[model samples]
Target: KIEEGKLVIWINGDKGYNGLAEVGKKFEKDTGIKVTVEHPDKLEEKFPQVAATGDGPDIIFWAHDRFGGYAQSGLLAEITPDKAFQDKLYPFTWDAVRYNGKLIAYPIAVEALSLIYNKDLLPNPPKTWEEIPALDKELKAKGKSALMFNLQEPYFTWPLIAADGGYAFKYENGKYDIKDVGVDNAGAKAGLTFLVDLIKNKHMNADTDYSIAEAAFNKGETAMTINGPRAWSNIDTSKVNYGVTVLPTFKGQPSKPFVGVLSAGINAASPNKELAKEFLENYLLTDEGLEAVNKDKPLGAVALKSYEEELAKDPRIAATMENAQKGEIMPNIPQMSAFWYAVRTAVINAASGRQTVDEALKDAQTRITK
Candidate 1:
């Protein structure tokens, strides 16, 4: 039950504007709820300012892992999905939006990091991180860099650690247990050792940024890189024969990706709360609506059951979905920000030859614990 008026919404500008605008139009037509979508370049700064004044948008579309900040600060409203609606959602999708036993958002889409390689260069991707060094050596002997990775970004390093059976935080006693944080775990140390050796052996450049790595891969300057599905949109499939697959494992364990979901959350101070709820339910939560969002996006749908028939035809898409199924959802805890920054800095320092791997990780653990 919603009033007949405009429902203001805020969303990230980087995500597709055309798709959201189209859905906004359809939302108004179906429910007589006029929708106004606002794209702010600095949502991180603006959202809190608005929430502080009790004037935030009715609906805010953002990554669910970041919701812990807003929720803990009383900027978001907890909306428990009905049993029927909860049952319809994929388990991982549901898990992503839940924090501290409360549902703070409704998921729109899920994404996982995978190894994207030039199929022309290597038909079969390496099965484990141990194999990667040998591949690098083989390629180097032939005067080529075998891999390109963003040593600066945790998204790349985290998966490598997970490949070696490491984790940022573990769930225990119905809450996150940070006591045994994996930043300095032996497996994590091994993962870092592999990366440091690669850098020292001229197999990878520590200075390569994300865009640089992507462009290098696209131009055939490098063989493979770790990235998400969004990178696939710009790739010229004809010129570069590329294939996406799960990250190489370590000791028979699959490389666990930091799976994340984009979701729509209801703002606690919104004047149009009811309308926003109805709009999200009818458009984002419905099968037809979910399909429309997933059609062009091609990452994966949160509504797993309905989108399967449409996705079955493309083997790449199917494999990407399968990889996502085996991934770990990003934790929606407030302390995660501090954890990520400290850990990433440690890994970066270690890879750059600034500090020993053990010293860098110990520093990271100390900073996070304090």
Candidate 2:
């Protein structure tokens, strides 16, 4: 029933595959099991059809968001990594792979949005929104805004809202309670009001979208913006002189941005499940294995505690990881689609003055519930 001595993995990107390819050679030598990693086209769209028929690769590697659907559909094999290794990883790393009380994947890397600021403009970044107005006045005196971000984008604004106890879905007891939406609660109202007031006070532009804000920040027209580590590539560091740090707080509450994780899982339908599991646990989960992967796309935050020292070598990575400690993993449920759409409408309406913050969020909560 198995493809003897061989294992196949379908991955999302070339960078991920290249690193796995380097490690696969060792797995082959160690166990005489040949490992082939492929960067398949349209993985998200194509994986389900083939996997359901029991005719796909032994392993599927990608972001953690899809695992919820996969596990629900019985496409992902149950995983039981070595307890020692499991214990050594960040607690939130497991949050990405756990579905309905089962472990379905091995977490690899973590990432979250951080407050990106121009060091030249604000040598000491504001720790809270109250502090931002003073910086706003200073920047205004110099003909610049204190801050600008994707004002109508909920993903970028989540930290500000969630800092005040707002959450799209309540994650508790290792599962997301999709029915318990908190985006319109008292805490959320406080958060949304602050965001809208920033526009009213002229500290930031209500019209700034992601592209506009990013461009403004790049040109030094804005002192700060909210973005993830991946955005560092497009930014000209020489011109911006930016620093990546935790977001400014909301009413003294810590910002809790959504953490995203990349992971690998065995296919429930794979004929080579045992070999694939062996390969993953022995070869792919090692420090050297992850190190190879990180060489191409330097990991924002490795799941393994042992890699912290190495990851801290890059200040940007360290900052993002620091924020990760304060972050919660994004929900990977089907309702998340509805959550995003509803929240976007809420942000847009409030930012545009088409609706009050209370009116917008209440409408959004209804949209999510329905």
Candidate 3:
């Protein structure tokens, strides 16, 4: 049998529950509120269904992007604004956890892609795309390269879309409208062209995947890399002397990376609602709690306002905030389910120098339309 006064946490495997489990020790000891962490496979697919039942967990630790559907479905509880949660976190964090004007989750951490560079090579990262080509050529002459990124994944590649003026959806009246697809627009083309030009001119490799690129970066084989908080666990911080900053400008404009939120929501059906809320506010929201949960080298940036400047002293958090400040929040609507494949295909096709910008984006639109 479980503990009589247990607060259960249901989390996915992507973010293992070890850290939170470690933190649970203090909460349990201090408040006498036993906490149990559980990982269910296919959590995104299974959470809402199981949570609707009374047997669901007291708290749900998951990404904010998918939690909106749960909030809209009434499976998650609205955080009562008793504590002024609206003014407490970053403005973008509110946008992430809100659904239909109701706060669905407490934003735990926020993530966005940023430039990670070797401090030895460039005392400072290049601020503009115009500088990369020349810098890359010089590096290549010395058997080095200026930047390395996963060319096959669109998540890292799509920030240029924002840099070039493209957007995924238009938000109006608090709803993300699907019809405002901007994948095939001029901004997308400019971004895609820049990526393809890199491969064509030998600045980046068309075949690099996430692991290959990140591994090379940790080895100091590349001068710069672009990645997010999730990439830090694999990085050997002791071996690689690196620095991070906001992404480089592509075409006289800033790169707007996707702002993704990591959040924890109270299950509407949880029996321990008040205790859960208290546990979250008292234990999980503190600086000590956050440090325990994110003891891993690089997780996401902590979302608490009080720790913003403190964590910024760490370069990883600094880069995350830099991107999240200007980065666009990914829509939570089901319509966004179709957005990834569309953007991914276009990026991969264009980056390989195999397809023209128009052709690549046209195929993307066709997939979404179909």
Candidate 4:
């Protein structure tokens, strides 16, 4: 029942398109199996419907967070990497691609938010929130912000809340207890209040979104900004002298941002299931294949172990990998979709002065649980 010497792949976006396209040619030449790589719109929305009818691509590339739904729906093929393969990558990667303790995909890149500072303005980056007020006072004289980031987005705000042990759901023994939400906990309240303090203290603008923060940082109008490696390319480095490091601590506790992984999973509905696995194991998992995919744009913190030396040469990539290891992996379960909306609304409300941190978190917890 094979697709007969042909394989199809859908990349969530074109991030690694050049490398995959280059490798596809090699795969075809060596195995005599034609490989077609596509970048399509509405991939996340269309994948499930197409897979249910057994017409989806053999491989689906996307963030690991999206795989839980596919695994739950029996639309993803479970993969068990050999010990050698397991030893060849960062251990935390598999955690993002798992559902019910089963690995559903292979991690390609690891991402996490880090504090990037203007080296020209800051000789040294602050290691804790307490160190920020001094810098803020200094920057204030220069008419620049102490820090900048997406104020209304939970992804950026989660680190502040997480530092105090706040989480969207309870995870125990490798499973998320969706019914138990923790956004309104005392620790979460303190953490969220920490973020709001920046606004109250006039260190940041309540209306600051990702674009504004990034633009401010790029224009040298902000001393620091919290962002991930994915946004590195968008920075106008010519205008600002910057350096990256792990997020500062809050109340002596490390800020744990949500680490996410970009990955690829085999489609359970593919007629070329066995062949697809062979392609993944024999070709894509090889060093040459990884290098090819990494060629066009280095995937900052690639999952492969062999890339450590090469990646460490770039300070930005090294800092991102360090933060990725220190951070918590984003929950991949379907409940996370609801969690995003609920938390985003709460963050926006609190940042805009519409509600206190406690009130906003309380509403978020109720909305998510309900």
Off by over 4 Å in 1: 1-5, 172-174, 178-180, 294-303
lDDT to native, each model: 0.75, 0.83, 0.79, 0.84
lDDT of 1 by residue, 1-370 (tens): 2123678778777665556667888987877767777888888678877887787677888887778778878888888667777766676677777667778888777677778898888888887877887898777777666789677888777877766757777864325665667777787787777778878877788888888988888888788888877778667653788888767877777777788888889888776766777777767667666665555344353545566546646655565666667766787787787788898888779878899988998898888767
Candidate 3: give the clashing pairs: none
State candidate 3's TM-score: 0.89
- Please report the TM-score between candidate 4 and the true structure: 0.94
CA RMSD, predictions in order: 2.8, 1.7, 2.7, 1.8
Candidate that beats the other on lDDT, 1 or 4, i.e. the better one: 4
Where does the lowest 10-residue lDDT sum fall in candidate 3? 291-300
Winner by lDDT between candidate 3 and candidate 1: 3
The count of backbone overlaps in candidate 2 is: 0
Each candidate's TM vs. the true structure?
A: 0.89, 0.95, 0.89, 0.94
In order of lDDT, best first, we have 4, 2, 3, 1
Candidate 2, run of 10 with poorest lDDT: 1-10
Model 1, residue 168: distance off in Å is: 1.5
- Of the two candidates 2 and 4, the one with more favorable TM-score, higher being better, is 2
Superpose all Cα atoms of candidate 3 onto the true structure and report the RMSD in Å to 1 decimal: 2.7
lDDT winner among the candidates? 4
Residues 190-262, candidate 2, lDDT per residue (tens digit)? Answer: 9888888888887877778889988888998888889997789778653779888877778788898888888
